[PDB]
Amino acid sequence: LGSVRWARALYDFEALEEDELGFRSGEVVEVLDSSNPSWWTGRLHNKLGLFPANYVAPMM
C-alpha cells in the first residue's frame, strides 16, 4: 500500500480547527493514516489529529 508511518514536518502547521494536529517544521510526526490525498492523520506529543499531507516528508 506504500503507507507512511512517519513523516518530517517541512513547514509549521497551525491548527485552526479542533480536529487538526498542529506542528512546527522539523518535528517527526507519527502517521496513522496516509490514504487521503489532502489530509493525513497523525500523532505528536500525545495529540491526535489531521494535518495537510503536502506539509510533510514521508520518512524511510
Binding site: 489530509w39 489531521l50 495537510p52 503536502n54 506539509y55
Partner: peptide, 12 residues
Amino acid sequence: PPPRPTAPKPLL
C-alpha cells in the same frame, strides 16, 4: 508554507 488543503476532512 503551501496553502492549506480545502478538501473536507475525514473523521477520526
